[PDB]
Every structure is written in structure tokens, then in C-alpha cells.
Write a protein that binds this ligand. Structure first.
Ligand SMILES: [Cl-]
Ligand SMILES: [Cl-]
Ligand SMILES: [Cl-]
Ligand SMILES: [Cl-]
Ligand code: NA
Ligand code: NA
Ligand code: NA
Ligand code: NA
Ligand code: NA
Ligand code: NA
Ligand code: NA
Ligand code: NA
Ligand code: NA
Ligand code: NA
Ligand code: NA
Ligand code: NA
Lengths: 266, 266, 265, 265
């Protein structure tokens, strides 16, 4: 008989049998970060279709942000990019009430954080190719694509540096974020869920420098042959009219995250 | 308030709020398939360290197979490569008693099947770049790497076609495989499991043609800087002595798999 | 004690890590799949891209996806390409022949790109090229640069090509006069150090083939999206696609006499 | 055929898709990070790869990782390279100068490979090259071909370079005589159509710099692993690493006079 048994005060991910690590309440994710952060106004009714019962949509707004993380401690010095898509919500739990960003989808260009995000915290991470920013100052751009098929373009024209009070306001702000997810695991060979729970991951970045500017984005609808596992996600978000881009900032700094600060909410 | 609610007779993966598909007990995976399948003899006691209690290791053997899937239905005609690493076991359950292959690890070069396999069936799938076969007949080879760092080389020299009665035997062996996995989902912000169960995925392929030959493989140890999320997996594998490659075949065909036929075993 | 080339030898940069003895019978041998389309466009517009010395035989652009495997000279490797050409007659001072003038070839691997350019003046450049995506009877590929789609190709197979039809198609493919222009710029000055037209007789042996309904679409790019190629893409995109005039999907192999390429004049 | 080249334009294949007006002050501008090592080796072995006409000044191989970002001629794109060179003296019939004889450059984007080779005889070839992996004080990269590792570089920063040391460094990096060999083969015959040495005066403006402990490791490849390049890699691997003589990590920018390159003889 097999000799593998999990240890009591350890944490794991599949494959568990190759071992894991001692639980530490003060486990950290540390990394350098750049973010291009946009908000756009859309149609409330249409966006509500994508927000689960239990949450209230606080504003007819979608938040879309490119982030690039470098010198990542838990990846022993590697890097990755992500596109975050969220909506501002209030959670009306039976135990917890709080405001945050309901995560719609996150694209990332590396699998390891995808697995971790989904399995540990119910963040709806999926893969895409995500260019680092192309820069002809004052212009910044990225492109996101699935197997050669473009589906999101972002552009930003920096118009000025944020300093003084306004930078304090910006900093103080970014420092605290309530990221909300939904960890769902399906039944095996049957409809429905084996596990289904909402999750809060408190995070924040320490902004060092910031610019304001003119932001834009564009979705390109995809066919199943183009993006078989994601076409309907893309096409759903593309259906949300971009009425106006209301916010656009480019920030540079670091993050120090208490990964064990995540918790189930209900 | 949000308008999204799951449908009763539907299956989902995160993000659930972008919808799913109606359950069909006869949901199929169909694809063309090439497999380069090796087995090697090793040390029993070392291999037993990675087999969960409840399983009995039936031989001191590791099975390692390159597979290439094309014309994949659920990926709307897409493709991907993998490396399957398993050992022969008997599950000694309180309810189920059966023999199959305990999946130690699977590398794939595409995220979609990695998420599905982990979340739907507990197959411990992770990411690596995997070369298509390089072919200078009778020599065939692949190389498996992580962010530029080689960790697995596989080589095969074809020495003969398998025909007639012996081809009939091989087809049989391949038609029915009991793939065994472990679906584990960690608690949020605490040690241990929220979900922990063993799973069976009955599968197998329809072999059309087969060649026998001389197989070899070589593991290359990785540092945490090279493969931060996987080094210990690679290195555990590397530590299992390759006393002799005992089996080496190269098969082509197709697969027709009953996806909803996977089941939890206990 | 130093490096000197051998008289016997063929080289590519870097020459000093050595080369190989010339063989007039050096081959390229590979398995091959092709999705071959042609479309009718506007003569005047196309001629803008054809060098003086060539006559455009027809208002036609040939666009073909090829996938080469078990490639001998790549010791068993593979790559994909998109070939774009037009039918021409070369009115040389010595050479007089019909061929396919190469507008551009995208490849997804650098080695054939450097070889093609430097040995034979084939205008090879890089892009990401998907393998065929296949849900029969539908086939598709997407070509992109750093995440930016610029070509989509689609093909719906309507039937197998056989008998005399297959003989004809085999003939079409077996012998192809591929025409290039090998141009090397002067260093630190306008103009050319080397400028010559090249013929590379090649093709493929077709084994099996399907006919069907073909389509292609170009997506114009900006400089920030494809800084070295936007103007190529946008030129090709400017050629109206009036009619798709041939669409075939073929499988076989190729046996190419590499040293059969010659300068034409 | 309506395409004709313009007199005072510069081109690269495909010429027929246009080019650019010559500008003697054409610039390459970019941000640059370089991890620059040198090692001592055996003179007699290194000399085998150095062409006649050049004298090997010291038995030294320079290996540097560079990352370029915000590049003008790539409209804000980026790429990585590994530069491998040896210090030489050119005993020309006309030109007499010292510089670095470029042995091979690996780059992870095809556009600069094409330009470098065809414009200046710099022996660029493709590899996958990781951006630096960083767990301070440790920095690393890995370089590979189709998944097959062939070069690992490591660096442990031990301090800042300041004052006089920094001025020395700035001066070392600012003015570099990069040397190449532009070679283009005969079509279908052995030998050269074009064979000339080339000087590209370049160099970067170092803002900040760290000193530390550097290492490197080559891994030999087989032809199935690396068909186009294995002999280059294996040649380099064969050069013993007797001592790492310099190791620095710098951070700055470059402003290069692209049109300042010239044939030397
Ligand atoms: Cl995915
Ligand atoms: Cl891009
Ligand atoms: Cl190359
Ligand atoms: Cl100059
Ligand atoms: Na923590
Ligand atoms: Na396929
Ligand atoms: Na995927
Ligand atoms: Na690499
Ligand atoms: Na890799
Ligand atoms: Na072999
Ligand atoms: Na691309
Ligand atoms: Na030949
Ligand atoms: Na390129
Ligand atoms: Na190589
Ligand atoms: Na690989
Ligand atoms: Na690979």
C-alpha cells in the first residue's frame, strides 16, 4: 500500500502527493506592478445579467485593467501579465456585508497563477496571450489574443503626471481593494455543483507614480473555431456598450499581499 | 440586485455567470491521437512515497506517454500535446474496488484542458511547452520544457510494425483504461481541504496502426528559479531510477470518450 | 591559425563557424499539406507591386498555407508558411520563362526565413501561423503578428479530387517556377549592393486532394501593431478580392533540388 | 511591371512594397538593460573562429544579455538578445581599428535579425531568450532552441558602481566598434556573391550599474535538437571557461547612428 499522506498543518494544490507547504498566516505575495486601469460606463440592465444574485450592482460600470507583475516572490523571480474585468458591487450576505469588485473574468498569460487563483480563491482566471505595453510616449498599447485571434485592444495617451494631494488620493485609494470571486467546482458526471461559495480577497498596491490620460478599448467578437472555450465570454463583454471611458490611469509601484487573508463570505 | 442564477440541468466551470451547457449523459470527447508510450521499471519503495494510502502499487513501474490530440471536438477543431505520468494501482475503497493507472502528473501545452481536467475530474494537470514529434525515420523525439528550461527528453527508434494477432492484442489493451485521479480543493486561508475525493475517468483509444521499438527518456533537475511551481515534481520524478525501459510503442488512431462517465470512487 | 573559408564550401552567416561541402544534388525533402487559394483582383493595382522586367499574366494573387513536416534539413522539424504570389512572364535578356512572382512569404520559423532571403531572394518574413483547425468539412487558420490578426483563411471541403482531375492538379503542383528578388542594401547609403532576380524550380508531389469553397480576409494593421510589416499587409489588403478562383486542399510530399536555383537575366 | 525603386531610398526584401527616404541621421533609440560578462579562454581555440585579417587581442569571449524596450524603429516594441564577441584588431589595407568581432547574436524577434544580417553583416540567429528572472541579489536568464536549453546565465549583484568606477564603465560602454562580416552565397554554386567586413559604431548610455558575480553554462545540442545551430553552440561550448573576468548589470538608453555603419577593408 501507498505511503503518501497529507500533513496536518500544510497547504496543497493538485498533485497533492508531490508534497506541499507549511501553513503560514503571514504568507505573502510580493511583486513589482504596473497597471493601466480603465473604467467605462455601460447599460445597467445588460451588465446585471452577469452579476449573481446576492450582489447589488452599485454602478453601470465595467472596470478593465492591464497589469504586469515582475520580480514575483512566489514565482521565484518570474513575471506575468493579466487583464482584469470587474464590476463594482455590494455583497448582501447572511453573515457578511461589504463592497468590492465582482470579478467577471481575468485573462492571464501564465498557467500557474490561473490554477492558483481559481482553486484557492474562486477568481475566474483563463488564458490568453497578452502583450507587454508598446510605448511611443505619450502612447501606450496592448493587444490580447487567443491562438492568433485578436479580441481586446487597449490604448492610452498620457496627458500628465499625477502629483501632490491628487497622488495621495490615488495612492491611498489603490492601497485597499476588495476583490470578490466565486469558487465553483462541478459535480463529476452530473449537473450542478460539488462546491459553490463566494470569496473575498483583500488586496492593494502601493502606487509610487501615476499618470492620467485618454483611454480606449475595443473588443472583437470571436467564433467557436477561433476561441472554443471563451468565445461566449468575449462576446458577452463585447455586447456591453462602451458609452464612454470615464477613468484611465497608468500607475507604477509594488504589491504586498496577505494571501491567507482571503476568506469565504456568505 | 444581480440577475444571474445557474440553471438546474446545466454544467458550468468558472466563470459560471457567463453561462454553461445543458447536461448530456452522452457528452463526448472526439479527436485524432498519436501516442508515444513508455514504461520503465524502478524501485518500489521510492515510487510508493507518491501513491496515496488506499491505493496499492501493483508493479514497480512508471508509465510515461507523449500524446498529440488533433481535430478535437470540444475545442472546435483545435489541438494540444501532453505528457502523461502514471503508475499501476488497485484502489481499495470502502465502496469501489478496481484497478487502473494512478495519475502522478500530466503536462499539457494548453490551459483549457488543464482547467477542465483538474476541476472536473481531479487529473493533476500542469503546464509545459511540449514539442511535436521531431521525425527522422526511424527516429522520433520530443523535448518538454518550462520557460526555456528543459526537463524531459523522450526518444524512440521504430524497429517494426505491429501487425495481425499482436496488433489485435495492443488494440485491446488500449481500448480500455481506467484513469485515476484525485480531486483536491484547498480551504481558503487555512490548511487542509475543502474538497478531497478520488475519481475514475474510464477512457481509452482506438488504435489504427502501431510500431514497436527502442524507447528512452531522461529527466533534468530544475531549481526553483527555473520552475518555481513545479521543480519539486520534476525532481521527485528524476529521483525514481530508470532501471530499464520495458515497453516502447508508437500508436496512431482516434478516441471517443464518454466524458460524463467519470465518477467519484470511494 | 585563423578562419579561412574552403573553396569546396557553402556558407551562411556566421561563416566562421563553418559550412558544408557543395553538392549539386542537395535536396529538401518533407511531408506537405497545402491549402491553396487564388483570387481575382484589379490589374492596375497589382502591377504596382510587380518589378519592371515582368509582365503580369493575369489579375491574380495566389495565397497558400503550407505545412512542412519531417523536414530533412531541419533534422525532422516542421514549420508553417503563407505564400503570396502573382503569375508573371519574365522578359529577360537571356532568360525567358513563366513563373510565380513572390510578393511575400510568411513563415513561423526563422531558419527557413534567413535561408530563403539570403540564398534565393524569396521575401520571407515572420508571423505566427496556426496549424489548420479542423471540424470537417471546415478548415481554418489565423495569421497574426504579436497578437494582431492580419490574415484569416477558411475552406469548406465539398469533395475529393480524383482521376483526370487529380492528374491535372498534380501537374499544376509538381513543377513551379518560383521567382524571387535578392536585394542587399548598401551599407550606410541609399541603394543596392546586390540586386538580382532568382528562379527556384520547385513544387510538390500531390498524393490526395480535396476541392471546396475557399475564403480569405485581411485586417489592416497600424505601425504600433506590426512596425516592420504594416505597409505590406495594408498593400495586400488594398487589393480587392473580386472572386475566389481556385480553392484546394492537398497532401503529399516535396523533393526539391536546392542547388537548382539560379540567377535569371 | 510598374514597380521601380526610388534613387535616394533604402530597402529590404520585399523591395516592391516600398522603403524609406535615406537620412544620414537615421537613429535607433531605445531603453536598454545589459548583463555583460567576459570570460578568459584558450587563445588557440578561439583563434579558429576569428577570420584572417583580424588579430585576436586577448583570449576573451564577451557574452551579454540585453533587453531593449520602447524602440523607435519598432514603434514601441521590445526584444532580447545575447551578444557574443571577441576583442580584435583589424589590419586593413585601408582601415586600421580595434573593436569587437561579432561571433553570433541570438535574438528573440525576427525583424532585427533580418536587418542586422542584411544591413550590417551582424551574424544574428533566433533563440527563445527569457527576460531576467529576479530574486535580488540574484538575476538569471535562460536561452533555448525549441525547448532545448543551451545557455544559462547567472549574476549576483554585490554592489553599486559609482564615482570613478562608474565613469570608467560609462566610457567603456559608450563607444563600441561592433564588427561583422556580411556574406551572401552564390546561388546554386559554392562560395560568395558578396563578402565584406563591416563596422557598426554603437554603444549605450549607462545611467546606473551594479557589479557582481557572474556565471554562464553552455549545453551541447544535437542536430535533431537544433538543426541550424547545433555546431555554433557546440563550438562555443568547447571554449574553456578559465575565468570570468568581468560581470556587470547596467541600465540606460541608446542613441545609435544607424547610417554610421560602413564597409571596412
Ligand atoms: Cl483557458
Ligand atoms: Cl502587439
Ligand atoms: Cl535562426
Ligand atoms: Cl556613428
Ligand atoms: Na497571508
Ligand atoms: Na487540429
Ligand atoms: Na487555453
Ligand atoms: Na529560453
Ligand atoms: Na519552454
Ligand atoms: Na531514436
Ligand atoms: Na501573434
Ligand atoms: Na540540388
Ligand atoms: Na519580426
Ligand atoms: Na541553438
Ligand atoms: Na519544449
Ligand atoms: Na517547445
Amino acid at each position: 500500500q501507498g505511503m503518501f499522506r497529507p500533513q496536518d498543518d500544510f497547504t496543497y494544490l493538485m498533485p497533492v502527493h508531490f508534497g506541499g507547504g507549511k501553513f503560514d498566516p503571514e504568507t505573502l505575495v510580493t511583486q513589482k506592478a504596473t497597471a493601466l486601469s480603465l473604467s467605462f460606463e455601460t447599460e445597467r440592465d445588460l451588465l446585471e445579467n452577469y452579476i449573481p444574485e446576492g450582489f447589488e450592482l452599485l454602478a453601470p460600470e465595467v472596470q478593465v485593467a492591464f497589469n504586469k507583475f515582475t520580480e514575483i516572490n512566489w514565482l521565484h523571480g518570474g513575471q506575468y501579465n493579466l487583464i482584469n474585468v470587474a464590476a463594482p458591487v455590494r455583497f448582501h450576505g447572511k453573515k457578511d456585508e461589504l463592497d468590492g469588485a465582482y470579478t467577471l473574468v481575468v485573462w492571464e498569460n501564465k498557467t500557474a497563477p490561473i490554477l492558483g487563483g481559481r482553486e484557492q480563491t474562486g477568481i475566474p482566471k483563463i488564458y490568453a496571450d497578452i502583450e507587454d505595453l508598446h510605448i511611443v510616449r505619450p502612447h501606450f498599447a496592448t493587444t490580447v489574443s487567443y491562438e492568433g485571434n485578436t479580441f481586446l485592444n487597449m490604448d492610452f495617451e498620457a496627458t500628465g503626471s499625477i502629483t501632490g494631494r491628487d497622488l495621495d488620493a490615488l495612492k491611498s485609494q489603490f492601497l485597499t481593494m476588495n476583490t470578490l470571486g466565486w469558487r465553483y467546482i462541478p459535480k463529476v458526471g452530473a449537473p450542478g455543483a460539488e462546491l459553490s461559495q463566494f470569496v473575498l480577497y483583500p488586496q492593494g498596491m502601493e502606487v509610487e507614480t501615476a499618470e492620467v490620460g485618454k483611454g480606449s478599448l475595443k473588443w472583437t467578437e470571436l467564433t467557436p473555431m477561433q476561441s472554443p472555450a471563451q468565445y461566449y465570454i468575449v462576446n458577452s463583454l463585447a455586447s456591453l456598450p462602451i458609452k464612454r471611458v470615464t477613468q484611465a490611469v497608468l500607475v507604477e509601484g509594488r504589491a504586498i499581499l496577505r494571501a491567507m487573508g482571503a476568506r469565504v463570505i456568505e
